[PDB]
Design a protein around this ligand. Structure first.
Ligand SMILES: Cc1cc2nc3c(=O)[nH]c(=O)nc-3n(C[C@H](O)[C@H](O)[C@H](O)COP(=O)(O)OP(=O)(O)OC[C@H]3O[C@@H](n4cnc5c(N)ncnc54)[C@H](O)[C@@H]3O)c2cc1C
Ligand SMILES: Cc1cc2nc3c(=O)[nH]c(=O)nc-3n(C[C@H](O)[C@H](O)[C@H](O)COP(=O)(O)OP(=O)(O)OC[C@H]3O[C@@H](n4cnc5c(N)ncnc54)[C@H](O)[C@@H]3O)c2cc1C
Ligand SMILES: Cc1cc2nc3c(=O)[nH]c(=O)nc-3n(C[C@H](O)[C@H](O)[C@H](O)COP(=O)(O)OP(=O)(O)OC[C@H]3O[C@@H](n4cnc5c(N)ncnc54)[C@H](O)[C@@H]3O)c2cc1C
Ligand SMILES: Cc1cc2nc3c(=O)[nH]c(=O)nc-3n(C[C@H](O)[C@H](O)[C@H](O)COP(=O)(O)OP(=O)(O)OC[C@H]3O[C@@H](n4cnc5c(N)ncnc54)[C@H](O)[C@@H]3O)c2cc1C
Ligand SMILES: CN1c2c(nc(N)[nH]c2=O)NC[C@@H]1CNc1ccc(C(=O)N[C@@H](CCC(=O)O)C(=O)O)cc1
Ligand SMILES: CN1c2c(nc(N)[nH]c2=O)NC[C@@H]1CNc1ccc(C(=O)N[C@@H](CCC(=O)O)C(=O)O)cc1
Ligand SMILES: CN1c2c(nc(N)[nH]c2=O)NC[C@@H]1CNc1ccc(C(=O)N[C@@H](CCC(=O)O)C(=O)O)cc1
Ligand SMILES: CN1c2c(nc(N)[nH]c2=O)NC[C@@H]1CNc1ccc(C(=O)N[C@@H](CCC(=O)O)C(=O)O)cc1
Lengths: 267, 282, 285, 285
């Protein structure tokens, strides 16, 4: 069947905290294989990420994976943190280098596997990481992370489906045998999605830009339009063999819940 | 891999139709104060899309038409049936409209009261003489329940067109292939009017399904499965329904359909969004 | 490598159709000494490709019928090719049209492109009138994207059927750049029971600014990618030529693979582009 | 309508890459006054496209090193663009090469295309020698269809790896017409652990007779459809240009869709074709 995972971020306000827990209760009913919580060095720190992870586990029993980065952290610190997480039931970590230099994501994967037999997920970039020397180098890096122990790759979001398909083919050609899980970003706020995409070199098709044109002050239409795009995307990916999806919920459940419904993932 | 590129091509072609598609909206006389307000709010919202025309069902209609015309200046076409009316009484009601600014009328026989020898074709002819109205009639891609056969039903539409109907609006449908095959059959039968698809954006499946079973409109298995389990989830139903309708008009648009009629159920949200995807914007 | 493979397959198939494609060329009466010279140069160059026929337009409401007739005569005497004059009925009475038709027939002109003409009778009326005069080969216009004055796509399609039923044995389309529109229209013609081949009219574009204006007036869609391809080339005739040839070559390659074996070229009296496109279709001297 | 849809998708994607493609142009030392003039005209025309760099060949065993150096200097002073001289080691001793390298570096030449050269040391030896002289940007040749003298495809691939490991930061391919061969080679480079981008060398063909001879000598395959496309055009330069442009435009469109964002053009000192191909890639003045 189809497996799904949901990504959340640490709330910074009382309002967002309420929204998040509402979304977790709603989405947990879909029995995701796992959920994850992002890390922001200047937007919550490791303690806030960990707190949310602990809260999810206690409230839902679901496997919750914290996103752990290695910037401004020492190897000894990372080992101590990893040991603590393991001994506390956290056995899946999304290993990342982090949004800013001594170590790269592959170094963290190796460090984590030395501590314990963690389930590890790493970032993949269908349209190439902005800092990569080349597409070839970025693919060789993903192979490096997988070879170090990563169990699966989760991709940066994309809106050009062929870009993901072509990337998946290159991964297979390179001998990367783990699942390349598409990270899906349901878009309700285009202005913000466009900003993020431009910063990560993610192409926004001309038809998509036109689809959101003139909707700056029409939230309702943006939601229906964005849901249509996301549902169409997962439909095509599903037809192309994708059996795993990771949703960038941005702490909202409505869109991701509905998209999962169309994939047959229901309570 | 082709599925991906085909979708991009479909989406891009849709983005390029911007400002070339005509749309019409259908409303019904409100039965409560809440609906009254909802209706006028929707008319204001939808009026900004500059529809070719809007229509009002008839089971107060005359009032609604005038109100819409005297408020937006849109071509408000009232619906007229052959129920509870005599061939002579349908004439006084017919010239009153022309002597009031109403030149477009949707001619139908009408739903039979729960409890005549005059059909819609007979009604169309009974209007052309009074005056040269713009007559729009109903077409049934999946065949009208009472029709003895598909061909017989098709010939009837032709009869209604030859009588003076300058356009046909279809019963709602969810099987796009059925509409396309029907559109082809119409041309083969010599019907030279466009067969405007009537689109019903579904938010309440339970109710839509009941209406469908009553009008002989088929609900595809994939659609039934798509709405299964959402009886108590209005939010998901709306996103799913919008997706279905948007996918429909997108496919229809690529097939050359440049005219759409929306059964708004007096709500603007869904139809407004579907129009947005078709490039119909304020 | 889907795209790469699809390309090699498309290219090889095109290479294999050599000696199976029929082509026709459309010219217009020269208005200057320079254009007169250009036209005859193009006629000699293109005649070497042995087209099934060539045609010469006649601007409706122009009153320059004699020019069209003169050019047609010149082509026949100079090349021995079948030359078809375009004839419009919007600017002539039935009697005048019958006289014009009879003279054509007696002058050995047995193929006429019957049109209503750019602004009482419609093209179908002209077709009927011509068949009554003599057993002419008659070609008529088809519109994949619907004629701008049609009350509906259905009405326009039934009109084509009327012209064919009246005696037209060839249908030539308005130019287009949306290949899928032509393919869908071809299927719709079958649904309407039209049994004549729908010959695509190909317009090789070198001057985009002018083609865009023409397309806008005729309801012909210019894809966004095409508008982008010509953006910034207003003063670069060389690049426009290469880009336009690429577009036309791609178009006929796809149409060829779909089974089209007849092409009508709107040459604008120039031979270079049409000659090269024909070369890719295996139509060579 | 698979082929039609695939075309529209490919074309729209190409339109959307505008402002994301990097290009470079290769020239050769003019041998006559006419060619000298042609070259500078091409350099001015192409420089307006802001290429990442341009390069100038040096025929091994020619003894005309000065010409290459002179042209490079002229380009830098006239355009301010990065100009890379090609340097071969088959006709010079290590000491001579070190002197040549030092002078380039002191003259502001920081990018060299290091080659063994057309017939003791191999290109990898030159790469190592250059890096020892200074921190040069070094580009080397790659062969998707395997260099004719290689003992095996594996040996040739490992040789590219050796050159990259020695300090080369760019790989530029021999020209090709079999797009799938390049794509497969690109994947094989990843398998070999080569992390530099493999830049496709594009040869826009106008004179097929000459390109065929060159291809035959370099082991580059000419597809049967391509040979057929140029058949019968020996004395038709106009049609050859249109056909060749069509081929190159189709090639970069497919490569672009596959993620290639860097292209190196073998201009043969002419600007027209390369300029137009760049225009389709969104590289415009
Ligand atoms: C699914 C997902 C979740 C994420 N969650 C978060 C989050 O919670 N918090 C946060 O801060 N960020 C997060 N990010 C963003 C991420 O941290 C940034 O993309 C970051 O710049 C790189 O992280 P990485 O793990 O991909 O790094 P790496 O895999 O180390 O890659 C980073 C760059 O270094 C290059 N590289 C690798 N090894 C070498 C080498 N030896 N020499 C030279 N270059 C090399 C790569 O090719 C690449 O360009 C996420 C991204 C994804 C796709
Ligand atoms: C766009 C649209 C708007 C509508 N608006 C309204 C509205 O405002 N009010 C309302 O009351 N209803 C409305 N309806 C519903 C409609 O009135 C019903 O569907 C009704 O059952 C048939 O109407 P008709 O106009 O199709 O009649 P007809 O076209 O006469 O068709 C009815 C049946 O008679 C058959 N038939 C025709 N002539 C003969 C003959 N001589 N002998 C035997 N069989 C024959 C036909 O095949 C068919 O089965 C609407 C429907 C549509 C699609
Ligand atoms: C291959 C080709 C060659 C051409 N050559 C020339 C030329 O040399 N000179 C020139 O002047 N123009 C020329 N034209 C342009 C052409 O004359 C215009 O497109 C003109 O507007 C329509 O001519 P038609 O023959 O298609 O007319 P018709 O087939 O009569 O169609 C014109 C319109 O009338 C409608 N129609 C048909 N019958 C009726 C009816 N009974 N009642 C109401 N509407 C009806 C049709 O649907 C359509 O919208 C050419 C076009 C093509 C595609
Ligand atoms: C982008 C580009 C630019 C060029 N510019 C020029 C130019 O300006 N001037 C000019 O003269 N030529 C030029 N050439 C042609 C080139 O010099 C020839 O292809 C030449 O035959 C090989 O040069 P190379 O640098 O690839 O050599 P190398 O990489 O040394 O390879 C040549 C052969 O030696 C083999 N090989 C490598 N090491 C060993 C070893 N230790 N033992 C045995 N075999 C080995 C390789 O597999 C291969 O078959 C260019 C080619 C390209 C693709
Ligand atoms: C781990 N995230 C991430 C990444 N890639 C990089 N480089 N960095 C990241 O932090 N890829 C996946 C994910 C992307 N995160 C995000 C977060 C917010 C928005 C955004 O546009 N937020 C809007 C709308 C929120 C809403 O839905 O209401 C905002 O205004 O917050 C986009 C992507
Ligand atoms: C003219 N209408 C009509 C017809 N066909 C027949 N036979 N009769 C008709 O009146 N075809 C088109 C249109 C269909 N009308 C309708 C009206 C309501 C609903 C419906 O499902 N109503 C629900 C939900 C309303 C809502 O969205 O709030 C209801 O419970 O009222 C469906 C079709
Ligand atoms: C019979 N023609 C025609 C028609 N459709 C209509 N409505 N009317 C017509 O006359 N369809 C086919 C053909 C199109 N004719 C033309 C004629 C000129 C140009 C044009 O753009 N001419 C430019 C460039 C000429 C050149 O290439 O040198 C010009 O400025 O003349 C386009 C289409
Ligand atoms: C560095 N060149 C090169 C190589 N490979 C090898 N082995 N040797 C080389 O010198 N690969 C890339 C490039 C190819 N150079 C060339 C040079 C000329 C022609 C050629 O066919 N020239 C024709 C036409 C010139 C024109 O277009 O005007 C000629 O007759 O000069 C082809 C490839």
């Amino acid at each position: 069947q189809i497996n799904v995972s949901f990504q959340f971020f640490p709330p910074r306000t009382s309002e967002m905290e309420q929204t998040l827990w509402n979304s977790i209760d709603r989405l947990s009913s879909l029995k995701p294989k796992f959920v994850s919580v992002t890390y922001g060095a200047n937007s919550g720190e490791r303690d806030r990420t960990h707190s949310i992870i602990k809260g999810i586990k206690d409230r839902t029993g679901l496997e919750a994976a914290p996103h752990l980065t290695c910037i401004d952290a020492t190897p000894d610190e990372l080992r101590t943190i990893a040991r603590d997480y393991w001994n506390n039931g956290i056995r899946h970590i999304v290993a990342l280098r982090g949004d800013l230099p001594e170590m790269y994501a592959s170094d963290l994967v190796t460090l984590l596997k030395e501590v314990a037999d963690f389930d590890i997920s790493v970032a993949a970039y269908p349209e190439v990481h902005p800092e990569a020397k080349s597409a070839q180098a970025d693919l060789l890096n993903l192979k490096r992370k997988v070879d170090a122990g990563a169990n699966r790759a989760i991709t940066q979001f994309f809106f050009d489906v062929e870009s993901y398909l072509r990337f998946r083919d290159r991964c297979v050609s390179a001998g990367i045998d783990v699942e390349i899980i598409p990270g899906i970003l349901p878009v309700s706020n285009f202005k913000q999605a466009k900003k993020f995409a431009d910063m990560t070199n993610v192409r926004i098709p001309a038809w998509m830009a036109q689809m959101f044109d003139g909707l700056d002050d029409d939230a309702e239409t943006r939601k229906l339009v964005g849901a249509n795009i996301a549902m169409d995307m997962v439909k095509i990916l599903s037809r192309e063999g994708v059996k795993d999806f990771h949703f960038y919920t941005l702490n909202r459940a409505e869109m991701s819940y509905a998209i999962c419904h169309t994939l047959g993932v229901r309570p």
